[PDB]
Design a protein around this ligand. Structure first.
Ligand SMILES: [Cl-]
Ligand SMILES: [K+]
Ligand SMILES: [K+]
Ligand SMILES: [K+]
Lengths: 272, 278
């Protein structure tokens, strides 16, 4: 493949020689043959090279040419076509992914928001939720599928899926990307539980979100959680919840986040 | 070492059969032998398997490996010992990495903030800045080194290094970790440029930070930027910069960020309500 070309450019960018990288267990001929695309190298040997070069495996694959994952290739395209509300490109895209079950279900859920003829069937959603109940750990794939399809999942399943996601998601201490997404979807599920006064779920979600935010910055999620948690208190008769919601609005205004400000201020003039 | 055992558990959890994964690049028997820990597999073919299973390489390595990289293992230890303010543990740590030039210099810089007896020499810092200038594309390694050693880099080299980092850092559409740290380091450099009134450098860094924050969430960096940009506005005669600085303090307070609130309020009181002469 072209993995060797990527390794050579990164190695030369750091002014590191092949000889300095090679040692008693991975030779210079093996590194060079890999860099020249004439030979393959094992996964453990590639990770050892990147460790010596102080390059994350995540930096290496994102530095590599266009070999984005099958999923992020679709996600990047679907986000482009949705930003332009291009229904024609989205259906051609849905046509190109008809052989992929969960992927086409997600495209239908996204496309339904801007064109009402399209929507995922309940059999398609259940196939997705069945899959999501079965996974050992929740990765970027599972999290994005849930977030883009949550409007078509009945609440009780959405809460159980949220509980599975919070207790078994894959995050690293160096890449908190999945942890941040899990927090946002947990807050979104907390919002719905408060709307229906399912305060048994709200109290559980508040505990998990507070734990997810511990030892983290995540000021956006804390601001949203400040509003949502205050919304929870207000619906339980605690008038102090109004102050938390107004403080969150103040943060949006202070940072010039006008879209979030009006989106949450409209929710505040409602329900009050 | 037993990569296949981890891959097997993830695949079975996804209810995927080995037959569905076999193609012209890897056969069913080849996949099975790898899952049983009886053989290794090339990097390109492991990535193709993970791609069909929709598992990123980052989640797979973090799931299987119970060890971190060389530099992040060091980083975790420094951060744990620094949080404890334990000078003795940081000194033993310094000795475990004394054979690593840049790493030792970073430890000395970090340790110096709570132990003035130890300090990185100017020859140690110059070798590090030499390395940082020589890099074609800055990554997580180069960014962390510059951040933790900034207190011992003279301002003119720090701004030039900031220019290089900010111009040539690896862009990732899916992992904003490096972009966020670059933003934080650019804000830190803008602070120093405002203190010393290098207002041409300030305009440059301001324009860079504005792009980095755009289309991102990153409310923390925006809150610090609101304060620091208001600080620059005050130093240029714009009294409205005080309101921006006070609004940033209110954000820290509303979110319960007590440590950040008192650090920036102490800076506010010294620079806005401090000593006035004549
Ligand atoms: Cl911009
Ligand atoms: K390979
Ligand atoms: K099962
Ligand atoms: K103070």
């Amino acid at each position: 493949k072209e993995l060797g070309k990527t390794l050579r450019r990164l190695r030369q960018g750091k002014q590191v020689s092949i000889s300095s990288l090679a040692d008693e267990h991975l030779s210079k001929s093996q590194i060079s043959r890999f860099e020249r695309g004439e030979s393959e190298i094992s996964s453990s040997r590639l990770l050892n090279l990147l460790d010596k070069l102080n390059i994350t495996i995540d930096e290496f694959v994102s530095t590599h040419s266009k070999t984005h994952t099958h999923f992020f290739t679709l996600l990047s395209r679907v986000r482009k076509y949705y930003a332009e509300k291009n229904v024609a490109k989205l259906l051609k895209l849905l046509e190109d992914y008809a052989h992929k079950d969960y992927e086409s279900t997600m495209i239908k859920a996204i496309l339904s928001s801007i064109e009402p003829t399209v929507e995922p069937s309940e059999e398609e959603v259940t196939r997705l939720t069945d899959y999501l109940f079965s996974v050992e750990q929740w990765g970027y794939y599972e999290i994005i599928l849930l977030g883009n399809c949550s409007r078509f999942i009945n609440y009780n399943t959405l809460f159980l899926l949220t509980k599975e996601m919070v207790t078994s998601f894959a995050y690293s201490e160096q890449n908190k990307t999945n942890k941040t997404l899990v927090t946002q979807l947990s807050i979104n599920c907390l919002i719905i539980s408060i709307d229906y006064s399912y305060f048994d779920h709200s109290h559980y979600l508040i505990e998990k979100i507070e734990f997810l935010l511990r030892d983290e910055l995540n000021f956006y999620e804390k601001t949203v959680f400040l509003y949502v948690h205050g919304y929870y208190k207000l619906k339980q008769g605690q008038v102090s919840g109004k102050d938390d919601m107004r403080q969150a609005l103040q943060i949006f205004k202070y940072l010039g986040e006008d879209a979030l400000y009006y989106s949450y201020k409209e929710h505040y003039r409602k329900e009050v």
